[PDB]
């Protein structure tokens, strides 16, 4: 019903910032991409939809320091992000972190996302990597692991695939209803 907070957690470090500014529709072609300040609170309206969605990023443990409280969730929508390249972040986020998130509560809406798309690029990093090195892990591979359960969304985001995290802000208002 009211603005809701959301945080992004992934393997080690993911979509540090470029992800936070996704909706910003900055798109690589644009030099704009300040990372000096971490964003996680922005008020934007869509076609007459006044709401505010907070978004986190990298920060592995998202609390490297254990001293901090491990209880009292400050988010209602869990956003998992992994770089679309290197089965490392993919195999972990959806597998190793899933149980960590599940422990917090029985079941809750889960949005699936990725970072640095296919290696901060996709067109100049796929051909340069080598056809036999492309080893993509999103198209269907990602859908399988989501199906293993039942996330919510299914896409990526990286100064490009931010064709979702953009259309997400609007979906965020839907989460507030819950």
């Amino acid at each position: 019903m009211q603005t809701i907070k959301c945080v992004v957690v992934g393997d080690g470090a993911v979509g540090k910032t470029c992800l936070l500014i996704s909706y910003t529709t900055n798109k690589l072609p644009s030099e704009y991409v300040p990372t000096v300040f971490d964003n996680y609170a922005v008020t934007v309206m869509i076609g007459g939809e006044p709401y505010t969605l907070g978004l986190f990023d990298t920060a592995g443990q998202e609390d490297y320091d254990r001293l901090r409280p491990l209880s009292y969730p400050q988010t209602d929508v869990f956003l998992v992000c992994f770089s679309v390249v290197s089965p490392s972040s993919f195999e972990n986020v959806k597998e190793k972190w899933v149980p960590e998130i599940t422990h917090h509560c029985p079941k809750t809406p889960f949005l699936l996302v990725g970072t640095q798309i296919d290696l901060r690029d996709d067109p100049s990093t796929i051909e340069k990597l080598a056809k036999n090195k492309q080893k993509p892990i999103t198209p269907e591979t990602a859908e399988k692991l989501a199906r293993d359960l039942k996330a919510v969304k299914y896409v990526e985001c990286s100064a490009l695939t931010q064709k979702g995290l953009k259309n997400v802000f609007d979906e965020a208002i839907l989460a507030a209803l819950e």
Side-chain angles (χ1 to χ4, degrees):
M1 291 185 182
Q2 298 178 348
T3 169
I4 199 72
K5 296 185 184 228
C6 145
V7 297
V8 182
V9 181
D11 184 6
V14 287
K16 296 184 185 198
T17 318
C18 295
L19 173 139
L20 295 176
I21 68 186
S22 262
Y23 80 99
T24 327
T25 304
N26 294 340
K27 296 185 182 224
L28 249 171
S30 187
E31 295 183 351
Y32 183 85
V33 64
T35 72
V36 175
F37 296 95
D38 185 6
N39 302 133
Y40 78 96
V42 187
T43 183
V44 64
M45 63 186 71
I46 306 306
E49 285 136 60
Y51 61 79
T52 269
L53 184 67
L55 303 172
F56 215 61
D57 63 15
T58 175
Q61 192 179 59
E62 196 185 4
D63 180 4
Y64 296 96
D65 293 348
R66 294 187 66 165
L67 211 307
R68 265 169 242 151
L70 307 183
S71 301
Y72 206 65
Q74 199 174 352
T75 194
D76 291 353
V77 189
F78 298 98
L79 280 65
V80 295
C81 200
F82 66 94
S83 176
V84 192
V85 64
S86 332
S88 306
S89 67
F90 172 76
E91 291 295 344
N92 304 143
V93 165
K94 295 187 85 174
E95 196 184 1
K96 294 185 180 22
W97 301 66
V98 151
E100 294 183 351
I101 301 172
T102 66
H103 292 320
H104 291 89
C105 121
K107 296 179 65 154
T108 26
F110 354 60
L111 285 68
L112 181 63
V113 182
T115 185
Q116 289 191 244
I117 200 182
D118 294 358
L119 197 166
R120 191 179 69 186
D121 253 320
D122 195 343
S124 75
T125 186
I126 196 171
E127 296 183 352
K128 189 181 188 235
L129 257 62
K131 297 184 186 112
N132 298 341
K133 191 179 186 244
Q134 299 177 346
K135 285 160 171 68
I137 189 115
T138 6
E140 297 184 352
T141 306
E143 296 183 351
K144 188 182 185 268
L145 278 65
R147 292 273 297 272
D148 189 4
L149 306 180
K150 188 183 186 195
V152 174
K153 288 187 178 118
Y154 8 54
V155 79
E156 307 73 20
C157 125
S158 122
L160 193 67
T161 321
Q162 58 188 24
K163 296 185 185 168
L165 264 170
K166 184 183 184 58
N167 300 127
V168 165
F169 267 76
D170 185 5
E171 293 296 343
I173 199 170
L174 187 71
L177 185 68
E178 298 298 341

